[PDB]
Design a protein around this ligand. Structure first.
Ligand SMILES: Cc1cc2nc3c(=O)[nH]c(=O)nc-3n(C[C@H](O)[C@H](O)[C@H](O)COP(=O)(O)OP(=O)(O)OC[C@H]3O[C@@H](n4cnc5c(N)ncnc54)[C@H](O)[C@@H]3O)c2cc1C
Ligand SMILES: Cc1cc2nc3c(=O)[nH]c(=O)nc-3n(C[C@H](O)[C@H](O)[C@H](O)COP(=O)(O)OP(=O)(O)OC[C@H]3O[C@@H](n4cnc5c(N)ncnc54)[C@H](O)[C@@H]3O)c2cc1C
Ligand SMILES: *[C@@H]1O[C@H](CO)[C@@H](O[C@@H]2O[C@H](CO)[C@@H](O)[C@H](O)[C@H]2NC(C)=O)[C@H](O)[C@H]1NC(C)=O
Ligand SMILES: *[C@@H]1O[C@H](CO)[C@@H](O[C@@H]2O[C@H](CO)[C@@H](O)[C@H](O)[C@H]2NC(C)=O)[C@H](O)[C@H]1NC(C)=O
Ligand SMILES: N=C(N)NCCCCCCCCNCCCCCCCCNC(=N)N
Ligand SMILES: N=C(N)NCCCCCCCCNCCCCCCCCNC(=N)N
Lengths: 459, 462
């Protein structure tokens, strides 16, 4: 059967690969941008390549092997480093200047950890139907006996680093049952390794693609006509006998099936028109799940002024405004000579910042740093890079997040095909939504569902 | 039968009144503060009395009579004014100076209202269990076909005005099924009236209390000994046989039943100790519901520098930072010539603001005002009032909000009595949670449940 695959990010390339393996080689992969890899994407900033998107392989060293790991660490040997969060307590900056007392901070962190652990015990007792689910915030109130969760600047920044820095939305919006604990860590292990290689984390996608598409023997570039870039799908017509797909450049294609890998955010926009319209059950499941936004703002400076050394990699800024430029990282190991810093923001701050100029953002950031290092002469950053994933029509966000209120069944309707229209992507991952490994496994699972239906007539 | 009522806010007084009416007169009302009224309470600001808490009678001129309306508008004749929001599109300020084009703004408002009307149709069809609920935000995404809700400065302040200004938490956290549409409005009417009377909205509570508690001939002061002020209940012991209540000043009292009217926030803090400890199902129901915070920041100036006149009462500040000093009100009718402005904030901003000095908040507000009226010479406020309800241990917030995640059955567990312990208060109103009328009705309702048990020996709950 001929199958069209929309998008060449991790899940599409992974699905097309699994299909090829089942012998379905009459594939046509239509990618909107001029390159493959999607949300795994590097860029040159200040003379070095940095990740605009995914940057870590998360869940390593546990009882099960994360499928992405061996590819990164062994096959490609991409250069990487294990992240150590053990010293945060020495690195939390007061709004006004200097760090807080390490011991006071270590205790707040412990407290927050213990609450989360009680949350894990509670979560384990909820019903599968999801009828007792609650937000993480609700769990925090219950466990600490208060009418509110973390509320002082220090408590809030710890709360942010613990939850928003991972999920990109606050605990109060997040489903407890479906995030605490996270399978990723539960199955694959607690460690995370930051990929810092000039070839880019995306190299993992290129490697997979190359196992089945044709590439130039000199170039190594993919040259298989089954892959077509700069193809923006804008309409998908389907019927019980097949599908027709139309691109923005006016091409029209026909196939037996279509496998849609665009992000949940793309699905929640009107970029692709379905004809007929998708059924209400499908539409509702789409709009109920969240497409979150995580913005990695890189900054380059004329010289260093922050600390470097053991436990110095990660540091927090405890603003009285929750989530305001709060999570910092310095790359003494990764980009040794650079003078680069990375501050991460999400959600509301991300949408606000995407909507303003880089210069305006640089100026806000400069005020924060000077507040943090009142004792130093802080030079203005020379360059800044603000990724605009929510504004990008091909992504509309960075990764899904499971909101309180959505149960497994509705989550499942997200993965559900509609006649011959199949779906894949990180938001369709049964237990690893949000992650690279989840996009990867989702491609395989989606492809297998299509295979059984198409090939064995078992749908 | 002897009953102790904890709290002399609207619901406790209301409940006591109903028990009194059923002939249950061996009552003891224990009030933490030195006064009655609870969340209805005025204060002197710059020479005038302003309401720190409730300020409107919401839901008027509809199909049914809001029980509070007649007391306010007729029985007591408290000075009041219908609020008119028809001219908002002419009063939305740019983060950086002046207002937006009215036509541009009205279109955005109409769009927002339409999404909401679509939301009400969806809400009517959802399963009664609440198991199919979703946040207001999910509904917005669905109807706008976007991966986010209102996200530009104008759209965001309109959203906040439409939702946070009523509920005190964002749409994304709020239950659609339970707030859109709102019964208060469907049943009693779309209008709202702002009470601006020197005796305060709390006069309604004093009036009811007076219908059954003893007052002095010219004091008019209640002096019935069944009302004890300055009595903080810190412990409630209950058994098949009865109940014992202990206050902070060591007083101890016994009764056949106790009716607890303290806010949801008080319940979530652990001010009152229950012995034995409340059952888990009850504890969970208590922690799951939300206690919101709505902060009325009053400001006094040496001169006016803002517009007054038709459609001038309400104005918005379209900050690129959601919820940032966004909803303003001028008092040309209520406090003529007093030069006072009221800016309202909630939720995250409320908590931040309660934790810093009033001087710092005033300076933040001065900066906003000067960006708003750049061609004027904006004098610094000479006085500011920042109510701190969340920090007050007898309140711990302003009013409940129904969050996505709490279902019908869970809400009933929140209301449910435990042995001889009954609960009441706005958070126990099934259809009017959060409101003064909801408090008032919840009092009569809890009382009746108790009356059935006591007087008719009908003691099973649901
Ligand atoms: C800022 C950021 C930080 C992250 N951090 C990490 C991390 O450190 N670790 C981790 O495990 N995960 C992380 N993630 C998540 C991870 O990158 C994703 O889970 C994964 O890459 C998504 O793969 P996908 O195939 O589902 O989606 P995508 O990668 O979005 O692939 C979909 C593709 O479809 C294309 N497309 C869209 N619309 C159309 C159209 N109309 N026609 C044709 N093609 C179209 C897109 O261009 C894209 O190539 C991060 C992501 C981001 C963006
Ligand atoms: C800022 C604000 C704005 C609002 N705006 C409006 C509005 O405009 N219109 C409207 O309809 N509603 C509004 N409300 C909501 C309204 O005020 C409430 O719904 C209602 O007043 C609550 O009454 P209640 O009896 O349930 O609780 P409360 O008034 O809290 O009564 C409980 C009483 O118990 C006392 N108490 C507490 N703990 C103890 C203890 N341990 N022992 C003894 N006594 C104790 C408290 O002091 C209080 O007197 C607002 C409230 C606030 C605070
Ligand atoms: C990731 O890959 C490196 C690459 O080898 C691992 O480091 C080696 O492990 C073998 C196994 O015995 C040793 O004999 C080599 O000497 C090690 N190399 C180095 C440079 O130490 C590493 O352990 C891998 N990490 C994970 C998490 O799998
Ligand atoms: C609020 O109360 C005032 C007080 O009476 C109402 O105004 C009266 O309404 C009756 C009804 O026709 C008239 O006969 C009186 O002449 C009115 N009095 C005045 C002073 O105008 C008013 O209509 C009430 N508002 C609401 C919403 O009930
Ligand atoms: N929990 C641990 N054992 N450790 C976690 C260590 C923190 C790692 C810091 C990395 C910075 C976070 N980058 C996260 C991006 C990953 C996308 C995942 C979204 C998952 C959301 N999932 C659900 N909502 N169910
Ligand atoms: N919906 C209308 N027809 N109009 C409403 C007009 C807006 C009124 C503006 C007055 C300012 C808001 N004061 C609100 C305080 C009231 C407390 C009640 C909270 C409601 C909680 N309800 C639920 N979450 N279910």
């Amino acid at each position: 059967p001929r199958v069209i695959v929309v998008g060449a990010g991790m899940s599409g390339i992974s699905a097309a690969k699994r299909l090829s393996e089942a012998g379905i080689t009459d594939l046509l992969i239509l990618e909107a941008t001029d390159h493959i890899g999607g949300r795994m994407h590097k860029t040159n900033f200040a003379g070095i390549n940095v990740e605009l998107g995914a940057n870590w392989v998360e869940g390593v060293n546990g009882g099960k092997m994360n499928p992405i790991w061996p590819i990164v660490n062994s096959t490609l040997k991409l250069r990487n480093f294990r992240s150590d969060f053990d010293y945060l307590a020495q690195n939390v900056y007061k709004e006004d200047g200097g760090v807080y007392d390490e011991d006071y901070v270590q205790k707040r962190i412990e407290l927050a950890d213990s609450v989360e652990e009680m949350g894990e015990k509670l979560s384990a007792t909820l019903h599968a139907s999801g009828r007792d689910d609650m937000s993480i915030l609700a769990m925090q109130r219950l466990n600490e006996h208060q009418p509110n969760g973390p509320a002082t600047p220090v408590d809030m920044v710890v709360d942010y680093y613990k939850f928003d820095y991972e999920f990109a939305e606050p605990p109060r919006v997040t489903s407890l049952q479906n995030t605490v604990p996270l399978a990723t860590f539960s199955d694959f292990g607690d460690d995370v390794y930051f990929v810092a290689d000039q070839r880019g984390y995306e190299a993992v996608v290129y490697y997979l693609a190359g196992q089945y598409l044709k590439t130039d023997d000199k170039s190594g570039k993919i040259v298989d006509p089954r892959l077509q870039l700069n193809k923006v799908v804008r309409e998908i017509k389907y019927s019980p006998g097949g599908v027709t797909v139309k691109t923005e450049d006016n091409s029209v294609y026909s196939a037996d099936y279509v496998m849609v890998s665009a992000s949940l955010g793309v699905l929640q926009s009107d970029l692709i028109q379905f004809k007929p319209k998708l059924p209400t059950w499908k539409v509702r499941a789409i709009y109920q799940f969240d497409m979150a936004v995580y913005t990695k703002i890189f900054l380059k400076f004329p010289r260093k002024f922050w600390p470097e050394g053991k436990g110095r990699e990660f540091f927090l800024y405890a603003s009285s405004r929750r989530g305001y430029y709060g999570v910092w990282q310095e790359f003494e190991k990764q980009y040794p000579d650079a003078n680069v810093l990375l501050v991460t923001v999400t959600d509301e701050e991300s949408r606000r910042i995407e909507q303003q100029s880089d210069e305006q953002t640089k100026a806000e950031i400069m005020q924060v740093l000077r507040k943090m290092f009142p004792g130093k002469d802080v030079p203005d950053a020379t360059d800044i890079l603000v990724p605009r994933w929510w504004s990008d029509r091909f992504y509309k966000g960075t990764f899904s997040n499971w909101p309180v209120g959505v149960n497994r069944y509705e989550y499942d309707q997200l993965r559900a095909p509609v006649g011959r229209v199949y779906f894949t992507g990180e938001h369709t991952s049964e237990h690893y939504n949000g992650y690279v490994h989840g996009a990867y496994l989702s491609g395989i699972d989606s492809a297998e569902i299509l295979i059984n239906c198409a090939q064995k007539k078992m749908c």
